[PDB]
Design a protein around this ligand. Structure first.
Ligand SMILES: C=CC1=C(C)/C(=C/c2[nH]c(/C=C3N=C(/C=C4\NC(=O)C(C)=C4C=C)C(C)=C\3CCC(=O)O)c(CCC(=O)O)c2C)NC1=O
Ligand SMILES: [Cl-]
Ligand SMILES: [Cl-]
Length: 239
């Protein structure tokens, strides 16, 4: 991220989270994952503000696709997007987060380890480790939209009320990542039937994420409907 031209210009909480995700991934057995058209930097404008996106994407033997996206609309709107898609073979949940900020501060901060099992439960080891963290206190909880049924009971979705809350949220994401990295080492490869069940969970996650009109409208205002549909369905949430 020392290469990133966006990084210095993003909201501080976004910068801290980007750093924490990069630190988590840094020493993994990474290889690039080529996004469609080998996408890296992209920008677009139509009738309004310009949208700029830096797309980073990797894979490891355990993670089919690990994506970190940093974006800015004009000077008014900063976004961090991250998903780790695991190889269904290993039955790991989906780490994801999304942070949206403007000049007033962070408006939305979401993070989760989302289930892929048909029973919509996290694996037992994750349930146990996540419970041990204790329920965080946040002053300004937000209720997930209907498509958000995909998220676990541990999902965070807040407007951070102050710096203390910003730092508490980032630390909980660091904690989720530490659990996830550890559980990735200690799983326990699954049956062919179980592998299928997990693959299905991931497809469902992607289909539901594509119902988010908040993302879609930002993309559409800069690039148009067709571009946004391709980006959401082929670049971000590839089924
Ligand atoms: C890549 C480009 C990208 C854009 C343009 C983007 C925009 C974006 N996401 C938003 C919300 C949101 N974003 C998410 C969740 C996610 N979204 C995700 O991409 C992932 C991985 C999760 C969860 C792990 C949720 C649940 C909301 C709230 C939606 C709503 O209020 O309707 C919002 C509304 C913010 C607010 O209401 O304060 C915007 C503008 N997010 C992006 O990621
Ligand atoms: Cl909905
Ligand atoms: Cl508008």
């Amino acid at each position: 991220l020392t290469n990133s031209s966006l990084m210095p210009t993003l909201n501080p909480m976004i910068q801290q989270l980007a750093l924490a995700i990069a630190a988590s991934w840094q020493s993994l057995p990474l290889k690039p994952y080529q996004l469609p058209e080998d996408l890296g930097y992209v920008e677009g404008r139509l009738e309004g503000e310009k949208l700029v996106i830096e797309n980073r994407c990797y894979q490891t033997p355990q993670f089919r696709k690990m994506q970190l996206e940093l974006a800015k609309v004009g000077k008014g709107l900063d976004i961090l997007h991250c998903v780790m898609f695991p190889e269904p073979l290993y039955g790991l949940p989906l780490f994801g987060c999304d942070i949206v900020a403007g000049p007033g501060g962070v408006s939305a901060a979401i993070a989760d380890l989302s289930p892929t099992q048909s029973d919509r439960q996290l694996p037992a080891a994750y349930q146990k480790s996540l419970a041990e963290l204790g329920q965080p206190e946040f002053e300004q909880q937000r209720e997930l939209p209907p498509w958000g049924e995909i998220f676990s009971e541990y999902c965070l979705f807040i407007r951070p009320s102050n710096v203390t809350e910003e730092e508490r949220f980032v630390q909980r994401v660091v904690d989720f990542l530490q659990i996830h990295c550890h559980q990735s080492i200690v799983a326990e490869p699954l049956s062919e039937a179980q592998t299928l069940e997990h693959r299905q969970g991931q497809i469902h996650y992607c289909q539901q994420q594509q119902k988010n009109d908040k993302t879609r409208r930002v993309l559409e205002k800069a690039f148009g409907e067709a571009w946004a549909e391709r980006y959401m369905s082929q670049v971000l949430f590839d089924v």
